[PDB]
Amino acid sequence: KEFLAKAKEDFLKKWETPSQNTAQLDQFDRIKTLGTGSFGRVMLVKHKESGNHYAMKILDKQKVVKLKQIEHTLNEKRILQAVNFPFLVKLEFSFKDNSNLYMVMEYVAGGEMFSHLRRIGRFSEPHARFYAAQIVLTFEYLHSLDLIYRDLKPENLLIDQQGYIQVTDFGFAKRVKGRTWTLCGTPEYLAPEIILSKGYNKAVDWWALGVLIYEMAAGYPPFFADQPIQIYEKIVSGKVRFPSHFSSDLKDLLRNLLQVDLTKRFGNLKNGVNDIKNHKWFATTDWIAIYQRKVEAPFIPKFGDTSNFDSINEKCGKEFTEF
């Protein structure tokens, strides 16, 4: 637990002092944008100094106050500036303006895994094991800090130019030591304890992991239907039909990950994360090399190239004084 205690200490220290106003909008120059949302815009910018390319989000204070989404926008920045993991997108610069927010994070070139997965159709089980192993370490790091992710999906997994994972979206993130109740996520990745309106803890991410692995190896999510209300019935039913080409080790790992019983699910038992790390499916996985990122990636994207993607008066300023 040497790395575990070092991470928690440096996290809780950074958590109490959340840095801000550490750069200037004018310093970066505007480059072609990457995407937009209901609350703001996601862009790629270049710093005049050696910083150069950077991915930055510009959020409007009107948007987060209008739909009461302000609860998740304050958690997002604070969690980002305090974590330090290879598979998490590094937050570099953070500052506020009279009308906009600024989270300068690393630009990831390879694009969303959802794109590559849909192109290829399916990932080979070795290809899936490489991506899944990074998430397991990413969850163990976030669960030792009492954080839950609550939005695991291929559309939120970015591939860097070295073929590795960079988890991007932290909106629905929050640290809980017990349970929470907020309905957030994607219907095809919601855990049963979320749909039933019962309380849910850190075990929802280990459910989402089983869905993510299923979608990588099969090419489609395990629960799907015309109407979202049918998806909820399928999720709580506990009946999953595995594809033929699935291995015996993979089908066994998914039944434990996609367990409706919250206390018979891997990552929630007494052993914890090593329940999954020491599974017959992850036998070929060297976890120390994955963390240190010294493993040949099974796929490196084609490669700043954006080739893989497709009033001035202060308003509500005191509402974001912490930011």
Binding site: L67, H72, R118, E155, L183, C184, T186, P187, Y220, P221
Partner: peptide, 16 residues
Amino acid sequence: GFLRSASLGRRASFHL
């Protein structure tokens, strides 16, 4: 018993 393309498109996140 189909694999409809609407179930295979990009998926957004909701909040309530």
